[PDB]
Enzyme design. Structure first.
Site, mmCIF file in Angstrom:
data_model
loop_
_atom_site.group_PDB
_atom_site.id
_atom_site.type_symbol
_atom_site.label_atom_id
_atom_site.label_comp_id
_atom_site.label_asym_id
_atom_site.label_seq_id
_atom_site.Cartn_x
_atom_site.Cartn_y
_atom_site.Cartn_z
ATOM 1 N N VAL A 1 -19.712 -38.590 16.153
ATOM 2 C CA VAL A 1 -20.868 -39.352 15.729
ATOM 3 C C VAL A 1 -22.068 -38.290 16.091
ATOM 4 O O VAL A 1 -22.222 -37.928 17.268
ATOM 5 C CB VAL A 1 -21.115 -40.563 16.463
ATOM 6 N N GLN B 1 -19.630 -35.164 20.227
ATOM 7 C CA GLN B 1 -19.445 -36.392 20.701
ATOM 8 C C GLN B 1 -20.510 -37.177 20.516
ATOM 9 O O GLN B 1 -21.447 -36.724 20.029
ATOM 10 C CB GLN B 1 -19.212 -36.101 22.287
ATOM 11 N N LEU C 1 -20.887 -30.456 33.012
ATOM 12 C CA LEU C 1 -20.890 -31.815 34.218
ATOM 13 C C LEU C 1 -20.416 -33.006 33.563
ATOM 14 O O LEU C 1 -20.235 -33.263 32.390
ATOM 15 C CB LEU C 1 -22.581 -31.905 34.386
ATOM 16 N N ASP D 1 -22.301 -29.753 11.358
ATOM 17 C CA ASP D 1 -20.933 -29.851 12.130
ATOM 18 C C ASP D 1 -20.557 -29.172 13.278
ATOM 19 O O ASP D 1 -20.496 -27.868 12.927
ATOM 20 C CB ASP D 1 -19.958 -29.828 10.792
HETATM 21 CA CA CA Z 1 -23.695 -37.567 19.087
#
Ligand code: CA
Length: 320
Positions: free
Chosen positions: A296, A292, A17, A303
């Protein structure tokens, strides 16, 4: 650079979305991920679909993805692809695997609302509270325009009311009846199904993972608290630099009070389970899953680039 991630079949990344391959032509949806996978030897294609649509239907994302996959196969010379979907993109990937099973080697879903989103239920219920439909008209028009303007290709096929309905829990349950998969457990089980399917004689490997940053705490006066386990409480850099961090803590709190259980802000653990469930323990919100905003993530978030890379290696070792 190496061949750690060199799969037999190309990887097609499938956004959910709001998405597109690159927002406004400037911000990759899959931030840093195509680069990393290619550095490790994967052949990677990033679909660019309507950000706001159903998955089924002639105008839906599923037929868009099917057309894209056929172009990928013709370009690469491959006979199948590995579909990797985030969020609604996992539903879109299921559509293609059902209708064109000979073109698909595997389906991997990341934070996919196989059972819908309680937050979608909330939004649709609020819109239904206005009997004039004006709230629906005005909000959906704004969202649709957002989609048009941010699509890398200015794709004008944006239908936010269709996408909203699609992502409700009731509608997802209907989708699962219409497009069944052995990878799904029984409704209400909060358990996964089979790790593989054969569809029309074509075997598909099925995988998933989920983010569970947002955890329930204590109930007082009928209200259940929540905590964002991705973050150092309050002062985590991610609260400052990525506006989605605090927002998804809020939406995740709403979902907990709708009965979701632990979630990533928009999709519950139970909703996300499909195929071989590789993890539900990542301390991730919904967009940490795609690295994202701009990489961050909270201090306690794994990770996501490395997780995806390791999965390309897994696919390679499985023979796809
Ligand atoms: Ca984030």
């Amino acid at each position: 650079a190496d061949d750690y991630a060199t799969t037999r079949y190309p990887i097609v990344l499938v956004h959910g979305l709001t998405g597109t391959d690159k927002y406004a032509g400037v911000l990759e949806y899959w931030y840093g991920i195509q680069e990393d996978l290619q550095q490790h030897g994967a052949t990677v294609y990033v679909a660019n679909l309507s950000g706001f649509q159903s998955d089924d239907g002639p105008n839906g994302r599923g037929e868009q993805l099917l057309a894209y996959v056929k172009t990928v196969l013709a370009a690469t010379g491959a006979t199948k692809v590995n579909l990797v979907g985030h969020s609604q993109g996992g539903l879109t990937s299921r559509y293609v695997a059902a209708v064109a099973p000979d073109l698909v080697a595997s389906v991997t879903t990341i934070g996919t609302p196989h059972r819908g989103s309680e937050f979608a239920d909330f939004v649709q219920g609020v819109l239904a509270y206005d009997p004039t439909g004006l709230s629906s008209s005005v909000i959906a028009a704004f969202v649709n325009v957002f989609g048009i303007l941010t699509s890398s290709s200015h794709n004008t096929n944006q239908d936010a009311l269709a996408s909203l309905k699609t992502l409700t829990t009731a509608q997802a349950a209907t989708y699962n009846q219409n497009y069944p998969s052995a990878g799904l457990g029984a409704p209400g089980s909060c358990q996964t199904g089979a790790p593989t399917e054969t569809v029309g004689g074509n075997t598909h490997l099925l995988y998933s993972w989920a983010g569970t940053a947002i955890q329930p705490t204590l109930s007082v006066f009928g209200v259940t608290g929540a905590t964002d386990t991705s973050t150092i409480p309050l002062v985590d850099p991610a609260n400052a630099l990525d506006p989605s961090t605090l927002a998804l803590f809020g939406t995740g709190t709403v979902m907990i009070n709708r009965g979701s259980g632990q979630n990533d802000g928009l999709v519950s653990k139970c909703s996300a389970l499909y195929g071989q469930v590789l993890s539900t323990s990542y301390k991730w919100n919904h967009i940490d899953e795609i690295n994202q905003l701009l990489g961050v993530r909270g201090a306690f978030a794994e990770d996501p680039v490395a997780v995806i890379r390791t999965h390309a290696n897994r696919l390679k070792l499985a023979g796809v």
